[PDB]
Design a protein around this ligand. Sequence first.
Ligand SMILES: COc1cc(-c2nc(-c3cc(OC)c(OC)c(OC)c3)cnc2N)ccc1C(=O)O
Ligand SMILES: [Cl-]
Ligand SMILES: [Cl-]
Ligand SMILES: [Cl-]
Ligand SMILES: [Cl-]
Length: 246
Amino acid sequence: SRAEDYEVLYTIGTRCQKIRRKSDGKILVWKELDYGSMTEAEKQMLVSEVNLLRELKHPNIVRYYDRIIDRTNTTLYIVMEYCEGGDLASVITKGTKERQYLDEEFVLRVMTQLTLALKECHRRSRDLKPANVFLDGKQNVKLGDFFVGTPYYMSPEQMNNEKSDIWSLGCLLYELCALMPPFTAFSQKELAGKIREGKFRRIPYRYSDELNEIITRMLNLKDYHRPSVEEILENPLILEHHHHHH
Ligand SMILES: COc1cc(-c2nc(-c3cc(OC)c(OC)c(OC)c3)cnc2N)ccc1C(=O)O
Ligand SMILES: [Cl-]
Ligand SMILES: [Cl-]
Ligand SMILES: [Cl-]
Ligand SMILES: [Cl-]
């Protein structure tokens, strides 16, 4: 459980790094947290949060393996699973650039696997946005945990609840299909206006009426009209092959 046990291969983002465990060569990543400027109170909060990450064990949640303290650089390293497919944000950006919509099959995989991730989070009782959803090398979808930005996915009620998570999932799935979020605007007040009206374009026609129907239900203005996790998973669209596979 020391940094020396691992070799940094290179930096993914800014710090998050792809690393290799020396003992068996296993590829992982770690996230660097400089706690050198924190108070004792903040470090305590950090410790409890990290111990709670360690408890989450689910195929559709990014696996956290270890925590490493290097008192020399006052740096904490959270070691986690490597997701070779990167994040959903990049996938959506790629789709726009190459002017190519994503397969309905892929959207169904994300819907299925993220719904299961949410079901697990709710049972244990993480913002649902494309940058916080990762793809491994086997078509599996994993939920991670990362002012200026526009709050595209904020639910009507949250702007005034497990059904709020369903709204957010709805926005994410809509954006995967349309390559844009269901409500866009240049200011938050304008955005809020659009959200309260609850109107949006149908996802593109290449997608089935069945898929459009469920995403639209998730975007209902009334939280109680949005489908539950259980009701989503009962949908005839969702099949075994859309779930995770080792
Ligand atoms: C659990 O949350 C995190 C996951 C990761 C993480 N990121 C990547 C990753 C891989 C890429 O290409 C191979 C990327 O480029 C598109 C990429 O862009 C953001 C990310 C792979 N595996 C991972 N486990 C990183 C950080 C976090 C976090 O919560 O801070
Ligand atoms: Cl397009
Ligand atoms: Cl398709
Ligand atoms: Cl359209
Ligand atoms: Cl898996």
